[PDB]
Design an enzyme around this catalytic site. Structure first.
Site, PDB file in Angstrom:
ATOM      1  N   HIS A  99       5.662 -10.529 -14.725  1.00 61.64           N
ATOM      2  CA  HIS A  99       5.373 -11.786 -15.110  1.00 61.64           C
ATOM      3  C   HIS A  99       5.514 -11.846 -16.690  1.00 61.64           C
ATOM      4  O   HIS A  99       5.597 -12.625 -17.470  1.00 61.64           O
ATOM      5  CB  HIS A  99       3.982 -12.427 -14.702  1.00 61.64           C
ATOM      6  CG  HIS A  99       2.978 -12.031 -15.418  1.00 61.64           C
ATOM      7  ND1 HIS A  99       1.953 -10.910 -14.649  1.00 61.64           N
ATOM      8  CD2 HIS A  99       2.586 -11.778 -16.800  1.00 61.64           C
ATOM      9  CE1 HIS A  99       1.095 -10.616 -15.531  1.00 61.64           C
ATOM     10  NE2 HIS A  99       1.334 -11.230 -16.819  1.00 61.64           N
ATOM     11  N   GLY A 106      -2.902 -10.812 -23.063  1.00 63.10           N
ATOM     12  CA  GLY A 106      -2.226  -9.765 -23.591  1.00 63.10           C
ATOM     13  C   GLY A 106      -2.557  -8.386 -23.175  1.00 63.10           C
ATOM     14  O   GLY A 106      -1.812  -7.468 -23.613  1.00 63.10           O
ATOM     15  N   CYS A 119      -2.198  -7.448 -20.185  1.00 66.10           N
ATOM     16  CA  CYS A 119      -1.350  -7.188 -18.928  1.00 66.10           C
ATOM     17  C   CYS A 119      -0.591  -6.061 -19.215  1.00 66.10           C
ATOM     18  O   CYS A 119      -0.222  -5.892 -20.329  1.00 66.10           O
ATOM     19  CB  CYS A 119      -0.572  -8.380 -18.428  1.00 66.10           C
ATOM     20  SG  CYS A 119      -1.716  -9.920 -17.978  1.00 66.10           S
TER      21      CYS A 119
HETATM   22  C1  LIG Z   1       3.172 -15.019 -18.828  1.00 61.41           C
HETATM   23  O1  LIG Z   1       2.143 -15.900 -19.027  1.00 61.41           O
HETATM   24  C2  LIG Z   1       0.892 -15.613 -18.538  1.00 61.41           C
HETATM   25  C3  LIG Z   1      -0.189 -16.373 -18.740  1.00 61.41           C
HETATM   26  C4  LIG Z   1      -1.253 -16.282 -17.990  1.00 61.41           C
HETATM   27  C5  LIG Z   1      -1.498 -15.227 -17.082  1.00 61.41           C
HETATM   28  N1  LIG Z   1      -2.839 -14.991 -16.243  1.00 61.41           N
HETATM   29  C6  LIG Z   1      -2.964 -16.277 -15.287  1.00 61.41           C
HETATM   30  C7  LIG Z   1      -2.947 -16.046 -13.862  1.00 61.41           C
HETATM   31  C8  LIG Z   1      -1.532 -15.909 -13.480  1.00 61.41           C
HETATM   32  C9  LIG Z   1      -1.334 -15.299 -12.316  1.00 61.41           C
HETATM   33  C10 LIG Z   1      -2.420 -15.168 -11.443  1.00 61.41           C
HETATM   34  C11 LIG Z   1      -3.725 -15.562 -11.913  1.00 61.41           C
HETATM   35 CL1  LIG Z   1      -4.605 -15.677 -10.622  1.00 61.41          CL
HETATM   36  C12 LIG Z   1      -4.003 -16.029 -13.044  1.00 61.41           C
HETATM   37  C13 LIG Z   1      -3.617 -13.987 -16.393  1.00 61.41           C
HETATM   38  O2  LIG Z   1      -4.426 -14.078 -15.587  1.00 61.41           O
HETATM   39  C14 LIG Z   1      -3.111 -13.047 -17.313  1.00 61.41           C
HETATM   40  N2  LIG Z   1      -4.265 -12.172 -17.898  1.00 61.41           N
HETATM   41  N3  LIG Z   1      -4.766 -11.066 -17.307  1.00 61.41           N
HETATM   42  N4  LIG Z   1      -6.038 -10.742 -18.013  1.00 61.41           N
HETATM   43  C15 LIG Z   1      -6.400 -11.785 -18.655  1.00 61.41           C
HETATM   44  C16 LIG Z   1      -7.724 -12.122 -19.274  1.00 61.41           C
HETATM   45  C17 LIG Z   1      -7.913 -13.465 -19.825  1.00 61.41           C
HETATM   46  C18 LIG Z   1      -6.789 -14.138 -19.877  1.00 61.41           C
HETATM   47  C19 LIG Z   1      -5.483 -13.985 -19.250  1.00 61.41           C
HETATM   48  C20 LIG Z   1      -5.383 -12.837 -18.710  1.00 61.41           C
HETATM   49  C21 LIG Z   1      -0.238 -14.490 -16.822  1.00 61.41           C
HETATM   50  C22 LIG Z   1       0.839 -14.445 -17.438  1.00 61.41           C
END
Ligand SMILES: COc1ccc(N(Cc2cccc(Cl)c2)C(=O)Cn2nnc3ccccc32)cc1
Ligand SMILES: COc1ccc(N(Cc2cccc(Cl)c2)C(=O)Cn2nnc3ccccc32)cc1
Lengths: 304, 304
Positions: A41, A143, A145
């Site tokens: 992602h 951030g 991830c």
């Molecule tokens: C590329 O832009 C993004 C933007 C957002 C995400 N999301 C949403 C998402 C994405 C797939 C599944 C779910 Cl259930 C939820 C994330 O969960 C990434 N993430 N990880 N730990 C976090 C702690 C606080 C905030 C965000 C956080 C991922 C990628």
């Protein structure tokens, strides 16, 4: 004496963290040999996460679109491939700090350390467990991830987890280093609810053994039980069923303390039914389940 | 989201751990530049610890009696001196992995990470606090002496603690890196009892703010209090008095959450008087006091 929620020393993993940026998305990558592993992602915007077609999004990316920075120096990307939910970015330089490593897929109930990272930089290290519902209860901000989970056996790092997302419920989901999610989760911002977060019974028993070794013995009682009787109580309290495999795994702690596994089960059964009555065990007012029997032996013996 | 007892990444400190052996005693040392710091009780046998005369014991030791091993290579000792309760062993080689560092003497209530070591080898890392009675509740076995406590500010390690002993009560005592013990403890195996281990009120309030930020809000009530009224309750529950300095330190968390410091005090007052009623806050069934207000901001903002 004393018993702490201890993480593995993180130095070997710190030497592997890099920043990966694709377009306007920046997250962490793990650099081992000449490959950088990161969540697929990284190619998505926040909008794309609602319904991403990873194969189609990836077609629009070339090697030069993946910016990999190790410290303050840029790594040259000479190949990229998607394996399940991770991208493998082949770079032209092997990480000189690559430790001896393995990729392992852990079972629920197993513990590991997480090195929380932002922009390829480590912020902290903590110990956690893979829950029975395949989530982890971590501390991750946007951030984080690509931050990884690992165990260390002397000089070999076994990477078991890579962070991908936070469920709407505040719990975390991710993959092994082959890109396969733990549990039924998908890398899509959609309705994904976690199942029952049951307590890891074998870990609670191990931690009760650590309590006896480290002096806290008030909860020891005059009773015993059977696996079937204990499990009837465990089901009622959303504890995982205890198996003969778990009893066998607790053998060394039973031998060290002289407390039979089923006697410790009877102590746990009374703690579930009666509560703590305002008392604590190893500084906790609840039964701790994030220490495996191997963690208890390791910490109580001082394995380096 | 999520809030964990996070330790600092330990890599910078791992690069400083060495083994120090004198006679039949082996413990850990900290190698910074061309000096190795270790507990002066490395010169003692278990028998000597009952009534050691460090000055007299040290007269019988020469540079060649201090064996310092960094990994599997031996360091040459070209000088030794005792400063308070630490020995400084001057070696002929500067540690190539010496990070930017400072020696700091922390105040009670401040937190730090400990890298537990045995035979100069790291076993684990955990976060703890300097208790108000100047003890720490660590996880140390025989051989862990000389393991250090530290904080990191970007690339600078501030060493604050060196482990020396375990009191008969199972709690730990040590020195700053100048060799001065925290509290009234001495490096002698004698009757040394710790005073009241009060709860670090400002840290509990910071952790309540972390709970609100991370979603747990059930404990927020419709009340407020004053510092004097809150402190009457705090005294009753063996909590440290809250000062205007503490209120000021909690200002940024109060601003972020919109919950006035005295309103959070009134929530804490009700939690003390009513208990948790079988509920949890950030996965804890007791009020956590090992997070400073700075730790809460750091973890909630993702400082690397
Ligand atoms: C590329 O832009 C993004 C933007 C957002 C995400 N999301 C949403 C998402 C994405 C797939 C599944 C779910 Cl259930 C939820 C994330 O969960 C990434 N993430 N990880 N730990 C976090 C702690 C606080 C905030 C965000 C956080 C991922 C990628
Ligand atoms: C050189 O031989 C020894 C031998 C023993 C010690 N003592 C005893 C002592 C020593 C001065 C004061 C007190 Cl209150 C007590 C220690 O406490 C060292 N130590 N540190 N963490 C430990 C965890 C478990 C067991 C021992 C541990 C020190 C030196």
């Amino acid at each position: 004496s004393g018993f702490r929620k201890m993480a593995f020393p993180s130095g070997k993993v710190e030497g592997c963290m890099v920043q990966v940026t694709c377009g306007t998305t920046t997250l962490n990558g793990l650099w081992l040999d000449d490959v950088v592993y990161c969540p697929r992602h990284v190619i998505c915007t926040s909008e794309d996460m609602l319904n991403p077609n990873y194969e189609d999004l990836l077609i629009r990316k070339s090697n030069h679109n993946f910016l990999v920075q190790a410290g303050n120096v840029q790594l040259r990307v000479i190949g990229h491939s998607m394996q399940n939910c991770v991208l493998k970015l082949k770079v032209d330089t092997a990480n000189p700090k690559t430790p001896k490593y393995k990729f392992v897929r852990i079972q629920p109930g197993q513990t590991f350390s997480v090195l929380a990272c932002y922009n390829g930089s480590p912020s902290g290290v903590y110990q956690c467990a893979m829950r029975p519902n395949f989530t982890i209860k971590g501390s991750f901000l946007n951030g984080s991830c690509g931050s990884v989970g690992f165990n260390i056996d002397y000089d070999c790092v076994s990477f078991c987890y890579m962070h991908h997302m936070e469920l709407p419920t505040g719990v975390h989901a991710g993959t092994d280093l082959e890109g396969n999610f733990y549990g039924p989760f998908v890398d899509r911002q959609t309705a994904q609810a976690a199942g029952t977060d049951t307590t890891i019974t074998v870990n609670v028993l191990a931690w009760l053994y650590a309590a006896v070794i480290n002096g806290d013995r008030w909860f020891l009682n005059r009773f015993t039980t059977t696996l079937n009787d204990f499990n009837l109580v465990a089901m009622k309290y959303n504890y995982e069923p205890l198996t003969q495999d778990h009893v066998d795994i607790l053998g060394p702690l039973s031998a060290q303390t002289g407390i039979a596994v089923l006697d410790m089960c009877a102590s746990l059964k009374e703690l579930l039914q009666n509560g703590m009555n305002g008392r604590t065990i190893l500084g906790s007012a609840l039964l701790e389940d994030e220490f495996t029997p191997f963690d208890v032996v390791r910490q109580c013996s001082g394995v380096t």
